[PDB]
């Protein structure tokens, strides 16, 4: 605590007698972290889906992220730093966005009742945002820690192993719908919240953003389910008890 | 006992009351505004036509000034107005517009260029010069040669009301809504405040003040068909009347609007016919040209209403389960025109009539619209009961006489608010009152006893059946056309209705938030108001302005160049007491003559009018020859008073 923070806590204003600018900064950062995660996830879905193009394809993509063009067989630790960074933004975002949850019985009851009475699309979608957000506290953390601590186990073979043998598929299936619904709705609300594309016909822009939101979600969900099946199918074929699948892909170029 | 004190008490939160409150509050007088509803929901908010003021900014306003506005007002009133008051008004209207502009009212502005306009005598092109650009615009409204009606697109009353209400909030005026004045506190011929009923809690409270101003609006809801909000029941009028001292002026002077939507009464702006709207009958026949070959659809609103009723009486009306009506065809203006210049009217017919005006015709019928009558005051706005002031539609300051000009009423509300506001402020600051608790207790206890009796009444009459019968009687017998036989019948039935209202019984016994109890005390009040209207109409044997007696078709300047004054001195009497205040032609800047609209030579000339006229022509000529300005000439003809703050002249484009 500093003298200034004490003066602000007790007076409600800064030493210059103005309202704190912190609420503004927090609003900015909540949206910034949200935007980062939303875009990151889109790219994430494309890279992880390379499995549909063949093992050699995703294997090649995987080696690039490990800085193949700078290190021998690439260093998996690169992905560890990448994962750590995204984990930090994940936590920062959850911390800031959490401020928006209904926080007591009264708020929960009245909002839930209002949502059901209104049958208003964008209000209902916010509820989904909140629900999926809360769920990811548990689902997302599991995946992020593993990617950060076991980067050398990423590959067309090793990833399929974790998917099936380590029973990660149930978590991935749920997380898939959770993050895609959360992500697309979030990017959409971000657009209308800050009005970056409003222009001269705001209502038309919004109508288009809503359509784009639905298409993006549908496409990414389908692509996500196909990619899911791919990893699952391969994982179900790993029946050789003498083969170390978990570290197979790594045991190719160190 | 509960008592609230303030230096200035304002009853009514419309344009007039709020503006008067600004006047008193800005000079340090603690002021309270009482209102039945949140002030921004007052009827004033519904005005869409505009506000009349001689700015002279636009091309069609070029050359306009106080004199032209003054003449339109006087002639429009059919000489029933106090011309000195009309002068105070026209000279102040320009500053009301300008003050409101400074307060942020978004008046539509003029842009340089040509524009496709309808003159209905030469629907040509109008050009606005560069020096007019950015100034307050004006449109054709009220039938005045000079277009001086200012507006904020299609919601003038709304933006005006919000600005004045916001100014009251800025100044710290105490706004107390869901509060109803049910009686005035008075003693020795002086008003010390009002007994108020809190509509939410049911508490009876005495609001005492050095001065009390009533700005409660009109009394149109005594009629079944009206354009007025459901709160325009004239209770403010009634409480003044029930003091037995304050008088009501020209209550029989009621103005109707020709094209309200039927049967709701929701208004379809004058701009419809002004643009090219066509009136049709049961056969789809355009009938106005038949009665008015020249003016046709564009005749005086006063004339259109009469023709419409005449046409219906000839059996050409459209039959409906709600009564007979006519049609308003605006589709002929083209869907394009309607959705760009009448987008508002289109929404009305859809949201309520459930029809697309660009395709189907709207049912219409003339209905009660404005109340020229009201609480009688002197030029300062003070009533016979000292300390009681009135402004706005609730008053009979009488700048309207027997026919208010379209656009002059929202203008009056603000202007009177300013002027009466000054005199009211002066009274509150300089007067000293003797508040006796004995008197306060008598009035408060008297109303608490009244509320209790209503709740305990074992009467068997139904308040709603009585109120609804009153409204039918008013519509059937005290409308556009009146005759002695029917008026006599109306008065007798209203009197009988009044007696029965005292035997009302209500189901809900609670004292708080009880709409049924509210009707129980309001209805008897409305009946006394209705009686003043009907009886005043019966006794006035002449046709003047909006008051048309089929059995006395001529304007009688010999016997009826006066103002009806109604009072109710004895609480036991069942009929109002009527007296008359004669208008002195000697104090008229404009002697009685042809009003401009309607049949010519339809008035019984008064020899004194001719004398005064000659006297006027003489004074003008002499002074005019001596190279005297219109201001000096005006003073010589009829000097009038104005509070110091508003004595200045109005600068105009071109001086």
């Amino acid at each position: 605590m500093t003298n200034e923070s004490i003066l602000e806590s007790y007076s409600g204003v800064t030493p210059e007698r103005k309202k704190s600018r912190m609420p503004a900064k927090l609003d900015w950062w909540q949206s910034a972290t949200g935007l980062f995660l939303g875009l990151f996830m889109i790219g994430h879905m494309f890279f992880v889906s390379t499995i549909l193009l063949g093992d050699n394809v995703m294997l090649w993509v995987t080696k690039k992220f490990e800085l193949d063009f700078i290190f021998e067989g690439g260093k998996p630790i690169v992905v560890s730093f990448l994962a750590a960074f995204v984990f930090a933004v994940f936590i920062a975002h959850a911390f800031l966005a959490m401020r928006k949850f209904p926080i007591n019985y009264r708020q929960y009851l009245t909002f839930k009742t209002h949502k059901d009475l209104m049958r208003h699309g964008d209000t209902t979608l916010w509820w989904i945002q909140a629900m999926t957000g809360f769920a990811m506290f548990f689902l997302g953390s599991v995946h992020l820690y593993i990617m950060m601590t076991q980067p050398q186990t990423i590959g067309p073979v090793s990833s399929s192993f974790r998917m099936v043998s380590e029973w990660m598929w149930p978590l991935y299936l749920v997380l898939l719908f959770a993050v895609q619904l959360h992500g697309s709705v979030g990017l959409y609300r971000l657009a209308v919240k800050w009005g970056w594309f409003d222009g001269e016909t705001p209502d038309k822009t919004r109508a288009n953003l809503k359509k784009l939101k639905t298409l993006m979600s549908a496409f990414l969900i389908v692509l996500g389910l196909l990619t899911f099946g791919a990893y699952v199918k391969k994982g179900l074929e790993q029946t050789d008890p003498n083969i170390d699948y978990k570290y197979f892909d790594y045991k190719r170029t160190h | 006992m509960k008592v609230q004190y303030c230096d200035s008490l304002v009853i009514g939160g419309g344009l007039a009351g709020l503006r008067a409150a600004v006047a008193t509050q800005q000079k340090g007088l603690s002021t309270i505004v009482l209102s039945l509803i949140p002030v921004k929901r007052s009827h004033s908010a519904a005005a869409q036509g505009g506000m009349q003021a001689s700015l002279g900014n636009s091309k069609m306003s070029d050359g306009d000034n106080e004199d032209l506005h003054f003449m339109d007002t006087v002639k429009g009133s059919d000489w029933g107005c106090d011309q000195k008051v009309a002068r105070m008004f026209v000279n102040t209207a320009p500053k009301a517009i300008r003050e409101l502009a400074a307060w942020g009212v978004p008046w539509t502005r003029i842009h340089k260029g040509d524009r496709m306009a309808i003159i209905n005598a030469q629907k040509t092109t109008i050009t606005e010069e560069d020096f007019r650009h950015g100034l307050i615009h004006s449109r054709d409204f009220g039938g005045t040669k000079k277009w001086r009606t200012c507006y904020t697109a299609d919601a003038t009353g709304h933006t005006m009301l919000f600005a004045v209400a916001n100014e009251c909030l800025k100044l710290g005026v105490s706004i107390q809504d869901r509060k109803e004045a049910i009686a005035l506190i008075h003693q020795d011929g002086k008003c010390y405040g009002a007994v108020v009923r809190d509509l939410v809690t049911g508490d009876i409270i005495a609001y005492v003040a050095k001065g009390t101003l009533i700005a409660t609006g009109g009394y149109g809801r005594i009629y079944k068909n009206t354009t007025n909000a459901v709160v325009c029941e004239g209770t403010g009028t009634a409480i003044a009347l029930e003091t037995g001292i304050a008088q009501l002026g020209n209550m029989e002077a009621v103005q109707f609007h020709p094209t309200p939507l039927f049967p709701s009464g929701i208004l379809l702006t004058e701009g419809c016919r002004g643009d090219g709207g066509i009136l049709r009958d049961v056969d789809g026949h355009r009938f106005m040209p038949d009665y008015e070959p020249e003016k046709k659809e564009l005749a005086s609103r006063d004339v259109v209403s009469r023709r419409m009723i005449e046409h219906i009486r000839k059996g050409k009306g459209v039959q409906s389960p709600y009564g007979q009506h006519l049609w308003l065809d605006i589709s002929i203006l083209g869907r394009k025109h309607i959705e760009t210049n009448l987008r508002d009217v289109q929404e009305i017919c859809e949201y309520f009539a459930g029809i697309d005006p660009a395709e189907k015709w709207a049912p219409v019928l003339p209905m009660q619209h404005y109340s020229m009558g009201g609480i009688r005051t002197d030029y300062r706005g003070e009533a016979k009961l000292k300390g009681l002031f009135s402004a706005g539609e609730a008053a009979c300051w009488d700048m309207h006489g027997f026919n208010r000009l379209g656009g002059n009423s929202v203008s009056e509300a603000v202007v009177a608010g300013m002027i009466v506001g000054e005199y009211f402020a002066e009274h509150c600051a300089n007067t000293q009152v003797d508040l006796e608790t004995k008197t306060l207790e008598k009035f408060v206890k008297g109303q608490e006893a009244y509320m209790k009796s209503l709740v305990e009444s074992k009467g068997t009459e139904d308040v709603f059946k009585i109120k609804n019968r009153m409204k039918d009687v008013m519509d059937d017998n005290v409308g556009i056309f009146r005759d002695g036989p029917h008026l006599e019948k109306a008065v007798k039935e209203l009197e009988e209705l009044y007696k029965k209202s005292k035997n009302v019984g209500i189901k809900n016994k609670r004292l708080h938030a009880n709409p049924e109890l509210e009707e129980a005390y309001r209805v008897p009040m409305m009946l006394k108001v209705a009686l003043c209207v009907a009886k005043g109409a019966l006794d006035r044997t002449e046709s003047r302005g909006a008051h048309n007696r089929e059995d006395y078709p001529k304007r009688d300047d010999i016997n009826w160049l006066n103002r009806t004054l109604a009072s109710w001195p004895n609480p036991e009497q069942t009929l109002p007491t009527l007296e008359y205040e004669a208008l002195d032609v000697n104090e008229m800047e404009i002697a009685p003559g042809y009003r401009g609209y309607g049949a010519k030579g339809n008035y019984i000339e008064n020899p004194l009018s001719v004398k005064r006229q000659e006297e006027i022509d003489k004074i003008q000529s002499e002074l005019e020859a001596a190279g005297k300005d219109r201001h000096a000439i005006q003073e010589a003809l009829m000097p009038y008073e104005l509070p110091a703050k508003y004595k200045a002249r109005n600068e105009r484009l071109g001086d």
């Binding site: 309202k19 704190s20 609420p23 503004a24 927090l26 708020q107 009245t110 909002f111 209002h114 009475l117 208003h120 964008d122 209000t123 209308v192 919240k193 800050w194 409003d198 209502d203 | 509803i37 921004k40 929901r41 908010a45 519904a46 500053k95 517009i97 300008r98 400074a102 307060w103 942020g104 008046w107 502005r109 003029i110 842009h111 950015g134 100034l135 697109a153 709304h158 916001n166 100014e167 909030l169 800025k170 869901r178 809690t201 909000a229 459901v230 709701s264 929701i266 208004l267 009305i348 949201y351 309520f352 009539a353 459930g354 709603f464 189901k507 938030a513 709409p515 049924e516 109005n650 600068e651």
Partner: protein, 239 residues
Amino acid sequence: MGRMLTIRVFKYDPQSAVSKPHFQEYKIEEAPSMTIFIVLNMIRETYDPDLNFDFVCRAGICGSCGMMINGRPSLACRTLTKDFEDGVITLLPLPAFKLIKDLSVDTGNWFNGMSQRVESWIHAQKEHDISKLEERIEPEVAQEVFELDRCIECGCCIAACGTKIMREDFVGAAGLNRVVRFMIDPHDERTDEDYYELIGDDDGVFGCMTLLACHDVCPKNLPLQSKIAYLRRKMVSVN
């Protein structure tokens, strides 16, 4: 005929100790161009004079009759029974406002409080002489101000807002719109920093979660979505 309508109304008298919140049903025969205004008055005059509700203009201009009609805050005087293919209409008072009784709530005083909170009036150093020509204003500017000045303080956007329902100190869509209305008025001299001192906090613009229910129910169709975003961009950039 005209089909039979089933009107279900919320009834509760907080000032009466024995009153309990409940629904009451009425059977009303529909008629041509029938509105909730007509329905409620029919009920009052012939079936139940106890019922509280507020109407004034009955023309959708004053903002007095807002209420929840089948889950949506709407103006009762502008709502047609015809639009309910089912014949069942449920009426609730507007949430987020203090209840007086039944369908009557106190919107007026909350709004006056809001108007004072955002200082809803022209702020100018000098008073313009009212006996002189008015200051010139571009017609386009006057039109823009008018667009936002059309708000009738009906409260529908306040009651439609899940954020307001949960957090009562939230200034609401109407309050954010009011700030912009003065922001774009050349007559008002306040700067962005001045406005920040009014709504630059979590009870203000940063408290909005962009649910957009306000925009979708506003009976006057104000451009709330783009105007609130406009305000948010400006307030987040202060300093």
